């Protein structure tokens, strides 16, 4: 069924997009003057899960939580248990993503794809293991484990669609997870680990050299194949990154838009688009994160985010922050008046 | 009274800002990790009208509408009557700013500061004249007219604080008004007209040279003094631009935030900050407009917008689009949970 999911991602509706362009050109403004709001509306109009038009019903941010073996290499400043503490706080509404999702009218789904702690009540259990393998010394997981989790998360995602969610955001929580994110970005883009490794959650600058070394070691011991995104995810990714890629595949299969977040989400999007290029028209950037490897990842996705907030929290917080932008494109398209009704016509 | 208003603009509250920063650093996140949302929350905390804390109550976008004598010089591609048509469409809720304001939960106040038409019922009447003077041949208005309109608009704006408004946005409507906007930007920044004259509302590129010529003419003829922002507005501005400056002065007098829009609003902000430097801490950029002079104007304001939408509609549309960012800063500050746990 993974083969089938990938094969059956629909093409966007080019004919609806052309009708959308013509409609937007007739709205009460100089043609082209709403810029990327116009192109965002046309992008939405082509998503087959919507109604031929930009549309926003219910909104969901899917936050993928897991721990990482590579935390053992000293690449993170916070204690391991913070992943579990933060997942529990997600159920209480006290995290950055919760507060911003609430403001945007979106629901947060907290998904445990492999936290190294006891199960947390209120969290969706999709737990592959208690943390993934330490990527510096071997693979994060087996190929079968990565494929199974991709299918489970894609299915959970498209079930939300059947329930009326029309806009997704993706996020994550996982101490040390900027390490595998950087390894994937290096592998997919061909960039040296040094160009894409940053401070993550306030790693002291003195410790960056060790982190670059770890990323290189992970890449060397595993030999991830850039032509096989599932190989890359399984080898030098993690459960959270696989789960994020699964939300993108699910939403695409369902013909629905998904907002990216920051660097972790850019790395998962590089995997998803290598796995299935048909995913790409469904992705919407939110913000340009303040993480070192952001520019390179975004360049490889040919993405220009809407928001420049110097944000680096993760969790889906930037995706939630951008939800009103998607709603604004819809509001423009459906609620603006038209040039012809005011008899405004130029030669 | 305009002198008194300017003198009485409060300083931002350093103590409140220090308390806000300390609170933000203790939230459930790595320090600094919410970036400019943090800095915005602190900027808000300092504004005395907000009573010590980032908060947002009611929201209002003030859209300043007027016609321009310089339309006669061939600098605009729409008929002059489009100003009046659009101001009336604003009362009906069908314009870009209306639809985006409604999405943001804000009210649009449409204010006629000098449309060349009969008054439009349902539009706020602060009309100076039926269009301003053609800046290509003389001044837009007298100094007294500019000063009177600044005071009137500033008073209207701060009076909105009584109805619970805590967050303003500014906008305009006025065919040809990107011509005076470029003239003012040229004067304040020292840039040649060619560097700051754009297409406006889709002016054909073959008509750009003429627009550049008109801007230079206007400056040559009027000799605006860049160190006297009221002189610049009155000479090579327009009633809409003066109105926009007045909203900023009134918000600052009230100790309250105002979101800018695009190039017209940057031009009015440069005027406002020259008139009263104390205005500056109250201004919040929205988007980086897709207008030629934007980068220069924003550089002179030391401003880096949050949104990169290639937008160039004006009307306050970008200000409205940014209001949820201000609300996000307030939500972070008041609703997030709070944290020697770090590894050596
Ligand atoms: C049709 C039109 C023209 C200019 C403008 O600012 C808005 C609408
Ligand atoms: C305390 C903390 C650390 C990391 C993180 O992503 C969130 C909160």
XYZ file of C-alpha atoms and ligand atoms in Angstrom:
707
model
C 0.000 0.000 0.000
C 2.988 2.430 0.321
C 3.754 1.857 -3.378
C 0.079 2.509 -4.053
C -0.088 5.705 -1.934
C 2.890 7.187 -3.764
C 1.579 6.195 -7.199
C -1.905 7.675 -6.553
C -0.966 11.197 -5.356
C -3.120 13.307 -7.682
C -1.881 15.921 -10.049
C -3.112 19.376 -9.163
C -6.146 20.670 -10.977
C -4.626 22.865 -13.634
C -8.004 23.793 -15.080
C -9.299 25.074 -11.703
C -6.042 27.008 -11.400
C -6.590 28.711 -14.739
C -10.155 29.668 -13.758
C -8.769 30.981 -10.426
C -6.255 33.206 -12.241
C -8.954 34.718 -14.369
C -11.163 35.359 -11.367
C -8.335 36.988 -9.358
C -7.427 39.254 -12.318
C -11.018 40.588 -12.313
C -11.021 41.530 -8.591
C -11.175 45.122 -7.445
C -7.487 46.019 -7.662
C -4.739 46.560 -10.230
C -3.949 43.215 -11.771
C -1.099 41.474 -9.972
C -1.153 43.867 -7.017
C -1.770 41.260 -4.318
C 1.434 39.470 -5.329
C 2.048 36.174 -3.657
C -1.379 36.201 -2.043
C -2.708 35.782 -5.574
C -0.326 32.914 -6.397
C -1.094 31.241 -3.062
C -4.833 31.412 -3.865
C -4.231 29.855 -7.289
C -2.048 27.142 -5.691
C -4.908 26.332 -3.290
C -7.482 26.333 -6.115
C -5.580 23.471 -7.711
C -5.584 21.207 -4.668
C -8.143 18.462 -5.404
C -9.154 18.041 -1.784
C -10.538 21.590 -1.782
C -13.617 22.735 -3.801
C -11.917 24.041 -6.973
C -11.359 27.240 -5.106
C -9.254 28.434 -2.192
C -11.044 27.050 0.858
C -10.184 26.706 4.536
C -12.334 24.574 6.852
C -10.736 22.912 9.905
C -6.997 23.197 10.570
C -4.677 20.735 12.251
C -1.019 20.856 13.318
C 0.527 17.410 13.626
C 3.424 17.400 16.004
C 5.730 14.354 15.727
C 7.593 13.493 18.963
C 10.551 11.189 19.354
C 13.892 10.730 20.954
C 17.213 10.091 19.184
C 20.121 7.803 19.966
C 22.526 10.468 18.739
C 21.758 12.553 21.799
C 24.459 10.266 23.314
C 27.075 12.051 21.191
C 26.702 15.330 23.074
C 25.046 17.249 20.226
C 22.211 18.698 22.410
C 22.364 20.938 25.492
C 19.032 19.843 27.029
C 18.399 16.628 29.023
C 16.870 13.737 27.179
C 13.698 13.844 29.274
C 12.753 17.320 27.876
C 11.206 15.598 24.798
C 8.783 13.707 27.091
C 8.126 16.791 29.248
C 7.333 18.858 26.213
C 5.026 16.203 24.691
C 3.096 16.191 27.959
C 2.971 19.990 27.918
C 1.534 19.809 24.402
C -1.493 18.046 25.869
C -1.887 20.938 28.398
C -1.846 23.748 25.788
C 1.183 25.547 27.247
C 3.736 25.222 24.398
C 4.523 27.718 21.641
C 2.770 25.675 18.989
C -0.307 25.229 21.213
C -0.672 28.925 21.835
C -0.188 29.854 18.210
C -2.474 27.081 16.946
C -5.145 28.253 19.404
C -4.794 31.781 18.064
C -5.161 30.448 14.497
C -8.160 28.266 15.323
C -6.277 25.040 14.672
C -6.155 21.771 16.668
C -2.809 20.253 17.725
C -2.401 16.493 17.353
C 0.496 15.309 19.467
C 1.879 12.060 18.068
C 4.444 9.904 19.872
C 6.411 8.177 17.164
C 9.167 7.088 19.567
C 9.790 9.030 22.783
C 12.306 7.292 25.157
C 9.987 7.459 28.145
C 6.861 5.843 29.471
C 3.762 6.441 27.405
C 2.105 9.801 28.002
C -1.657 9.870 28.373
C -3.322 12.259 25.865
C -0.735 11.544 23.181
C -1.427 9.402 20.067
C 0.648 6.254 20.281
C 2.483 5.421 17.134
C 5.655 4.500 19.111
C 8.204 2.639 16.950
C 10.682 2.227 19.798
C 12.040 4.068 22.854
C 14.227 6.406 20.771
C 15.761 5.590 17.424
C 19.171 4.173 16.871
C 22.195 6.365 17.307
C 22.858 7.458 13.709
C 26.534 8.062 14.422
C 27.136 4.304 14.862
C 24.477 2.641 12.732
C 21.011 3.234 11.290
C 18.160 5.034 13.031
C 15.781 2.214 12.141
C 15.130 -0.576 9.649
C 13.722 0.181 6.198
C 10.586 -1.752 7.159
C 10.182 0.429 10.245
C 10.451 3.624 8.177
C 7.944 2.362 5.573
C 5.488 1.178 8.189
C 5.548 4.536 10.017
C 5.206 6.478 6.739
C 2.022 4.454 5.997
C 0.608 4.780 9.499
C 1.101 8.543 9.669
C -0.145 9.118 6.092
C -3.297 7.201 6.920
C -3.854 9.112 10.155
C -3.395 12.355 8.157
C -5.838 11.512 5.374
C -8.405 10.296 8.009
C -8.420 13.842 9.358
C -9.251 14.973 5.834
C -12.229 12.643 5.783
C -13.219 14.456 9.043
C -13.107 17.968 7.516
C -9.527 19.147 8.052
C -8.535 21.088 4.904
C -5.195 22.592 6.016
C -2.334 20.851 7.793
C 0.789 22.062 9.504
C 3.714 19.875 10.501
C 5.920 20.045 13.536
C 8.135 18.013 15.773
C 9.635 17.662 19.228
C 12.808 15.704 19.795
C 15.997 16.530 21.613
C 19.055 16.304 19.252
C 16.844 16.166 16.191
C 18.682 18.963 14.404
C 21.552 16.435 13.974
C 19.676 13.967 11.737
C 17.923 16.927 10.058
C 21.310 18.303 9.047
C 22.522 14.884 7.920
C 19.501 14.519 5.604
C 19.912 18.017 4.216
C 23.602 17.314 3.516
C 22.766 14.031 1.800
C 19.878 15.351 -0.353
C 21.446 18.687 -1.400
C 25.080 17.554 -1.643
C 26.167 20.244 0.798
C 28.967 19.576 3.228
C 27.782 18.968 6.788
C 29.621 22.155 7.863
C 27.382 24.351 5.696
C 24.147 23.051 7.274
C 24.848 22.346 10.968
C 23.625 25.011 13.382
C 23.100 25.661 17.095
C 19.691 23.904 17.299
C 18.309 24.538 20.790
C 21.118 26.906 21.904
C 24.092 24.560 21.547
C 27.126 26.566 22.674
C 29.261 27.548 19.606
C 32.258 25.687 21.090
C 30.317 22.431 20.573
C 29.484 22.903 16.838
C 32.660 21.136 15.692
C 31.681 17.927 17.464
C 28.166 18.139 15.922
C 29.600 18.476 12.378
C 31.823 15.495 13.091
C 28.836 13.423 14.260
C 26.856 14.248 11.122
C 29.785 13.188 8.941
C 30.177 9.966 10.924
C 26.507 9.124 10.549
C 26.709 9.670 6.805
C 29.837 7.522 6.513
C 28.731 4.494 8.536
C 25.293 4.296 6.959
C 25.968 5.245 3.315
C 22.617 6.758 2.748
C 21.649 6.806 -0.926
C 20.436 10.323 -1.995
C 18.405 8.690 -4.801
C 16.329 6.749 -2.243
C 14.612 9.018 0.280
C 13.282 6.143 2.354
C 16.880 4.830 2.637
C 18.030 8.239 3.826
C 15.181 8.590 6.417
C 15.805 5.091 7.751
C 19.600 5.506 8.001
C 20.314 9.078 9.123
C 16.835 10.392 9.954
C 14.686 9.640 12.977
C 11.139 8.742 13.866
C 9.996 12.379 14.044
C 11.420 13.154 10.591
C 9.773 10.051 9.128
C 6.502 11.087 10.774
C 6.756 14.571 9.286
C 7.388 13.151 5.814
C 4.330 10.913 6.384
C 2.092 13.921 7.061
C 3.266 15.479 3.764
C 2.627 12.245 1.838
C -0.788 11.845 3.510
C -1.889 15.392 2.837
C -0.662 15.125 -0.807
C -2.424 11.818 -1.351
C -5.602 13.521 0.026
C -5.004 16.503 -2.345
C -4.632 18.955 0.571
C -2.214 21.698 1.583
C 0.393 21.351 4.299
C 2.319 24.261 5.824
C 5.967 23.634 6.608
C 7.649 24.961 9.736
C 11.449 25.329 10.080
C 14.618 23.360 9.413
C 13.408 19.976 10.659
C 10.362 20.292 8.355
C 12.576 21.427 5.384
C 14.641 18.271 5.800
C 11.483 16.063 5.892
C 10.151 17.910 2.837
C 13.410 17.160 0.909
C 12.834 13.496 1.714
C 9.151 13.584 0.779
C 9.863 15.258 -2.597
C 12.670 12.800 -3.423
C 10.310 9.896 -2.566
C 7.437 11.400 -4.571
C 7.953 14.623 -6.578
C 4.124 14.840 -6.772
C 4.136 15.974 -3.130
C 5.669 19.343 -4.039
C 2.600 21.300 -5.218
C 0.921 20.621 -1.852
C 3.680 22.179 0.270
C 3.391 25.756 1.489
C 6.282 27.442 3.296
C 5.493 29.416 6.446
C 8.642 31.146 7.729
C 12.352 31.388 6.932
C 13.807 29.906 10.088
C 16.928 31.191 11.841
C 18.789 27.928 11.546
C 22.068 27.785 9.687
C 21.055 25.286 6.974
C 17.714 26.952 6.234
C 18.808 28.856 3.118
C 20.310 25.763 1.466
C 17.342 23.530 2.224
C 14.840 26.112 1.015
C 16.857 26.741 -2.163
C 16.713 23.042 -3.006
C 12.930 23.050 -2.494
C 12.657 26.273 -4.619
C 10.794 27.846 -1.715
C 10.560 31.420 -0.559
C 8.823 31.685 2.770
C 6.251 34.386 3.533
C 7.402 35.199 7.070
C 10.782 36.444 8.226
C 10.610 36.151 12.022
C 14.088 34.836 12.954
C 12.132 31.965 14.574
C 13.815 28.716 15.606
C 11.490 27.066 18.140
C 10.179 24.359 15.896
C 7.142 22.381 17.093
C 5.010 23.552 14.187
C 4.923 27.079 15.647
C 5.744 28.752 12.325
C 3.230 26.667 10.442
C 0.530 27.793 12.947
C 1.694 31.418 12.610
C 1.188 31.244 8.788
C -2.334 29.751 8.860
C -3.958 33.239 8.748
C -2.051 33.895 5.551
C -3.726 30.922 3.858
C -7.072 32.159 5.181
C -6.328 35.620 3.845
C -5.776 34.260 0.343
C -9.175 32.549 0.612
C -10.868 35.679 1.899
C -9.407 37.735 -0.967
C -10.622 35.245 -3.542
C -14.166 34.901 -2.213
C -15.001 38.193 -0.640
C -13.435 40.890 -2.853
C -15.627 42.749 -5.291
C -14.934 42.953 -9.010
C -13.676 45.656 -11.368
C -16.601 45.078 -13.750
C -19.232 45.815 -11.097
C -17.703 49.304 -10.757
C -17.252 49.661 -14.511
C -13.504 50.032 -14.099
C -11.904 49.036 -17.380
C -8.642 50.293 -18.905
C -7.494 50.037 -22.500
C -1.953 72.560 20.022
C -0.034 70.623 17.330
C 3.207 71.692 19.099
C 1.749 70.502 22.413
C 0.676 67.176 20.933
C 4.142 66.551 19.555
C 5.847 67.506 22.851
C 3.563 65.193 24.857
C 4.199 61.951 22.950
C 5.367 59.637 25.696
C 8.698 57.843 25.773
C 8.509 54.062 25.762
C 8.520 52.489 29.191
C 11.900 50.917 29.823
C 10.828 49.290 33.070
C 7.911 47.511 31.401
C 10.167 46.346 28.604
C 12.727 44.922 31.029
C 9.885 43.066 32.892
C 8.602 41.770 29.533
C 11.985 40.483 28.447
C 12.502 38.681 31.752
C 9.077 37.053 31.417
C 9.777 35.960 27.805
C 13.175 34.461 28.743
C 11.406 32.211 31.333
C 8.810 30.808 28.908
C 8.774 27.135 27.926
C 11.324 27.362 25.063
C 15.024 27.889 24.502
C 15.886 31.539 25.189
C 15.660 33.670 22.015
C 13.978 30.936 20.023
C 10.858 32.908 19.070
C 13.035 35.564 17.491
C 11.280 38.690 16.313
C 8.002 37.624 17.966
C 9.926 38.166 21.245
C 11.243 41.512 20.165
C 7.801 42.621 19.012
C 6.231 41.595 22.376
C 8.873 43.701 24.162
C 8.326 46.659 21.819
C 4.566 46.466 22.586
C 5.186 46.154 26.361
C 6.900 49.521 26.225
C 4.010 51.403 24.657
C 2.239 53.237 27.564
C -1.231 52.902 26.060
C -0.979 49.174 26.401
C -0.655 49.355 30.170
C 2.567 47.366 30.594
C 2.062 44.261 28.625
C 1.627 43.279 24.989
C -2.082 43.198 24.513
C -4.516 43.655 21.700
C -8.065 44.862 22.134
C -9.961 46.323 19.234
C -8.266 47.011 15.903
C -8.793 49.754 13.351
C -7.372 50.407 9.878
C -7.684 54.112 8.955
C -7.789 54.602 5.178
C -7.025 58.146 4.087
C -8.605 59.100 0.745
C -7.838 62.104 -1.503
C -7.236 63.279 -5.025
C -4.050 64.880 -6.421
C -3.568 67.740 -8.800
C -0.513 65.984 -10.233
C -2.807 63.453 -11.870
C -2.942 66.042 -14.689
C 0.692 65.395 -15.500
C 0.033 61.848 -16.758
C 1.537 59.953 -13.888
C -1.403 57.648 -13.161
C -3.087 55.089 -15.425
C -6.579 55.113 -13.763
C -9.129 57.885 -14.228
C -9.266 60.251 -11.255
C -12.843 59.209 -10.434
C -11.532 55.780 -9.333
C -10.555 57.360 -5.993
C -14.209 58.256 -5.234
C -15.445 54.942 -6.624
C -13.052 53.045 -4.403
C -13.851 55.088 -1.290
C -17.527 54.221 -1.783
C -16.624 50.555 -2.339
C -14.858 50.727 1.038
C -18.185 51.505 2.693
C -19.592 48.314 1.065
C -16.845 45.966 2.308
C -15.681 44.786 -1.132
C -12.091 46.118 -1.246
C -8.862 44.327 -0.407
C -8.359 46.152 2.863
C -11.983 45.505 3.908
C -11.782 41.802 3.282
C -8.403 41.437 5.037
C -9.472 43.673 7.938
C -12.560 41.547 8.393
C -10.417 38.427 8.429
C -8.232 40.024 11.145
C -11.180 41.186 13.201
C -10.492 44.866 12.532
C -12.730 47.765 11.567
C -11.929 49.946 8.562
C -12.440 53.698 8.971
C -12.681 55.337 5.580
C -11.673 58.987 5.892
C -12.063 61.537 3.083
C -9.278 64.073 3.482
C -9.833 65.605 0.034
C -11.475 63.543 -2.649
C -12.394 65.626 -5.771
C -16.028 64.608 -5.706
C -19.166 65.365 -3.709
C -19.009 63.911 -0.202
C -19.757 60.192 -0.007
C -22.358 59.377 2.600
C -20.898 57.029 5.271
C -17.300 58.198 4.792
C -15.725 60.282 7.582
C -15.483 63.907 6.347
C -12.171 65.612 7.031
C -12.014 67.129 3.552
C -9.428 69.912 3.063
C -10.274 70.702 -0.573
C -11.400 68.948 -3.747
C -8.039 67.455 -4.466
C -4.685 68.984 -3.591
C -2.645 71.358 -5.674
C -0.603 69.992 -8.537
C 2.810 69.525 -6.986
C 4.455 69.854 -10.412
C 3.596 73.567 -10.458
C 3.376 74.662 -6.876
C 2.586 73.311 -3.378
C 0.036 70.621 -2.543
C -1.417 72.839 0.182
C -0.582 75.603 2.599
C 1.390 74.956 5.793
C -1.698 75.908 7.801
C -3.766 73.317 5.906
C -1.223 70.565 6.623
C -0.986 71.484 10.293
C -4.766 71.612 10.702
C -5.238 68.196 9.039
C -2.418 66.617 11.160
C -4.175 67.825 14.305
C -7.620 66.695 13.192
C -6.478 63.198 12.238
C -4.251 62.767 15.286
C -7.212 63.680 17.504
C -9.559 61.274 15.707
C -7.065 58.487 16.037
C -6.352 58.865 19.731
C -10.140 59.267 20.386
C -10.508 55.711 19.073
C -8.626 54.497 22.154
C -11.884 55.374 24.068
C -13.788 52.815 22.073
C -11.198 50.202 23.032
C -8.862 50.359 20.009
C -5.314 49.320 20.907
C -3.829 48.580 17.464
C -3.955 50.785 14.398
C -3.118 50.246 10.767
C -2.721 52.965 8.154
C -3.708 53.050 4.523
C -4.685 55.321 1.644
C -6.627 55.678 -1.573
C -5.703 58.326 -4.112
C -5.024 58.066 -7.780
C -1.506 59.411 -8.593
C -0.373 59.348 -4.990
C 2.783 57.284 -5.598
C 4.130 60.513 -7.222
C 4.115 62.671 -4.068
C 5.164 59.594 -2.075
C 8.306 59.295 -4.240
C 8.953 63.020 -4.030
C 8.897 62.898 -0.225
C 11.089 59.793 -0.087
C 13.548 61.521 -2.465
C 13.646 64.617 -0.248
C 14.022 62.818 3.106
C 16.539 60.209 1.978
C 18.518 62.274 -0.576
C 17.973 59.627 -3.252
C 17.431 60.693 -6.885
C 13.868 60.266 -8.128
C 14.933 57.475 -10.517
C 15.869 55.266 -7.510
C 12.442 55.610 -5.873
C 9.818 56.002 -8.693
C 7.952 52.795 -9.484
C 5.024 51.623 -11.558
C 2.411 52.472 -8.957
C -0.906 51.055 -10.062
C 0.556 49.368 -13.206
C 1.784 52.419 -14.993
C 3.176 51.313 -18.385
C 6.983 51.183 -18.222
C 7.187 53.653 -21.198
C 5.528 56.316 -18.994
C 8.071 55.956 -16.123
C 10.548 58.545 -17.510
C 7.801 61.165 -17.420
C 6.953 60.288 -13.839
C 10.570 60.636 -12.815
C 10.646 64.056 -14.570
C 7.516 65.177 -12.713
C 8.917 64.153 -9.367
C 12.101 66.123 -10.018
C 10.046 69.127 -11.202
C 7.941 69.070 -8.067
C 11.041 69.134 -5.848
C 12.761 71.818 -7.966
C 9.689 74.097 -7.960
C 8.815 73.796 -4.341
C 12.215 73.508 -2.604
C 10.968 71.426 0.339
C 13.229 71.542 3.419
C 14.113 67.939 4.401
C 14.596 69.022 8.049
C 10.996 70.290 8.266
C 8.644 67.370 7.672
C 5.520 69.593 7.694
C 7.134 71.737 4.959
C 7.806 68.596 2.875
C 4.241 67.274 3.291
C 2.636 70.605 2.500
C 4.809 71.212 -0.563
C 5.253 67.893 -2.317
C 2.918 65.582 -0.416
C -0.858 65.304 -0.575
C -3.845 65.182 1.822
C -3.775 61.375 2.057
C -0.098 61.384 2.992
C -0.695 64.122 5.591
C -3.594 62.046 6.937
C -1.397 58.963 7.225
C 1.268 60.953 9.117
C -1.503 62.224 11.387
C -2.595 58.663 12.265
C 0.981 57.873 13.287
C 1.296 61.045 15.379
C -2.029 60.289 17.075
C -1.176 56.678 17.826
C 2.176 57.762 19.256
C 0.488 60.513 21.373
C -1.844 57.780 22.683
C 1.106 55.473 23.422
C -0.252 52.875 20.984
C 1.024 50.794 18.073
C 0.466 51.490 14.402
C 1.192 49.030 11.594
C 2.566 50.445 8.386
C 1.558 49.219 4.959
C 3.616 49.820 1.794
C 5.463 52.677 0.077
C 2.897 55.412 0.677
C 2.959 54.601 4.349
C 6.796 54.487 4.456
C 6.816 58.006 2.947
C 4.391 59.234 5.638
C 6.444 57.493 8.292
C 9.590 59.252 7.182
C 7.630 62.547 7.526
C 6.237 61.589 10.921
C 9.670 60.615 12.330
C 11.235 63.849 11.072
C 8.418 65.891 12.669
C 8.619 63.983 15.964
C 11.358 61.339 16.407
C 9.354 60.123 19.424
C 6.884 58.547 16.959
C 9.325 55.866 15.865
C 8.999 53.327 18.733
C 5.277 53.062 17.963
C 5.641 52.062 14.352
C 5.505 48.390 13.328
C 6.291 47.309 9.799
C 3.939 44.805 8.128
C 5.243 43.746 4.737
C 8.079 44.563 2.342
C 6.128 45.978 -0.507
C 6.939 45.295 -4.178
C 7.402 48.929 -5.004
C 10.706 50.283 -6.370
C 11.455 52.696 -3.523
C 10.581 50.337 -0.724
C 14.072 49.173 0.159
C 15.445 52.718 0.391
C 12.578 53.969 2.467
C 12.673 51.006 4.876
C 16.488 51.392 5.211
C 16.044 54.978 6.263
C 13.429 53.920 8.806
C 15.762 51.111 10.080
C 12.857 48.722 9.442
C 12.733 45.091 8.454
C 9.219 43.912 7.642
C 7.826 40.561 8.751
C 5.994 39.629 5.572
C 7.431 39.113 2.081
C 4.300 38.900 -0.070
C 5.343 40.954 -3.169
C 2.269 43.002 -2.369
C 1.644 46.459 -3.867
C -2.083 47.160 -3.465
C -1.904 49.669 -0.696
C -5.121 50.676 1.083
C -3.908 49.358 4.388
C -4.141 45.759 3.079
C -0.703 44.813 4.336
C -1.274 46.357 7.711
C -4.401 44.249 8.074
C -2.555 41.143 6.960
C -0.007 41.685 9.759
C -2.438 42.214 12.624
C -2.427 38.483 13.471
C 1.346 38.704 14.003
C 0.835 41.308 16.712
C -1.885 39.070 18.223
C 0.603 36.148 18.108
C 3.147 38.097 20.136
C 0.465 38.793 22.716
C -0.652 35.136 22.779
C 2.915 33.901 23.239
C 3.480 36.335 26.078
C 0.288 35.683 28.036
C -0.512 32.070 27.276
C 2.761 30.149 27.131
C 3.867 28.063 30.091
C 7.092 28.614 31.931
C 10.234 26.534 32.281
C 19.833 24.498 35.857
C 18.691 21.658 33.649
C 21.316 22.099 30.894
C 24.181 19.699 30.267
C 27.694 20.976 30.822
C -9.061 49.597 -9.538
C -8.117 50.090 -8.474
C -7.141 51.027 -8.790
C -6.269 51.481 -7.807
C -6.375 50.998 -6.507
O -5.522 51.444 -5.544
C -7.353 50.062 -6.192
C -8.224 49.607 -7.175
C 13.080 23.757 27.277
C 12.932 23.435 25.813
C 14.012 22.922 25.102
C 13.876 22.624 23.752
C 12.661 22.839 23.111
O 12.528 22.548 21.787
C 11.582 23.352 23.821
C 11.718 23.650 25.173
